[PDB]
Design a protein around this ligand. Structure first.
Ligand SMILES: Nc1nc2c(ncn2[C@@H]2O[C@H](COP(=O)(O)OP(=O)(O)NP(=O)(O)O)[C@@H](O)[C@H]2O)c(=O)[nH]1
Ligand SMILES: [Mg+2]
Ligand SMILES: [Mg+2]
Length: 172
């Protein structure tokens, strides 16, 4: 049954890895071990379909643009992660989205906007501005905490649903 290529993107330190490790291994990585490029497989059942999630966990800042280009080419859907106490990471979503659209030569690419670290008090990106961005892109917005696991499954499952809808549209 269907495989889904998910790529988790976002700035340094936003919690891409912590989110992915909560999904796969059900614990919170308290440490900060910066990523080069990690990948994970997981079988799940989403809306009664068995899915093989093929997950790419990308680096916060890449050494080569061709390395960004490549994961953007292979990925079927993108988890666009920012941290709610990191304004720059929120602003980087624009720049991710532009690079993804350019690389794929398309205006309609499955994505979900994720505001991570919702357990913190340090909030410099308000919910309304995130929801506005998402509404503008025409994609879902999900608030998450990898610390507590709030929203983690919903984030990844929504992205799968987004890919399914995109496939069903692209046939029509
Ligand atoms: N309070 C809180 N801390 C978090 C959350 N998610 C990640 N962190 C913390 O933020 C730091 C960086 O997390 P990490 O998952 O490594 O971020 P990343 O986006 O994968 N970093 P890189 O881009 O270098 O791979 C770690 O200290 C981690 O524990 C969260 O939801 N809440
Ligand atoms: Mg990481
Ligand atoms: Mg990055």
């Amino acid at each position: 049954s269907t495989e889904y290529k998910l790529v988790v993107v976002g700035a340094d330190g936003v919690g891409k890895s912590a989110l992915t490790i909560q999904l796969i291994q059900n614990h919170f990585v308290d440490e900060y071990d910066p990523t080069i490029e990690d990948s994970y497989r997981k079988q799940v059942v989403i809306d009664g379909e068995t899915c093989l999630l093929d997950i790419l966990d990308t680096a916060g800042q890449e050494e080569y643009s061709a390395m960004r280009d490549q994961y953007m080419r292979t990925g079927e859907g993108f988890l666009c992660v920012f941290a709610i106490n990191n304004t720059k990471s929120f602003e980087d979503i624009h720049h991710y989205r532009e690079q993804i659209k350019r690389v794929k030569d398309s205006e309609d690419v499955p994505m979900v906007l994720v505001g991570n670290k919702c357990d913190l008090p340090s909030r410099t990106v308000d919910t309304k501005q995130a929801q506005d961005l998402a509404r503008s892109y025409g994609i879902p917005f999900i608030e998450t905490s990898a610390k507590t696991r709030q929203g983690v499954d919903d984030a990844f499952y929504t992205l799968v649903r987004e890919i399914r809808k995109h496939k069903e549209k692209m046939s029509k």
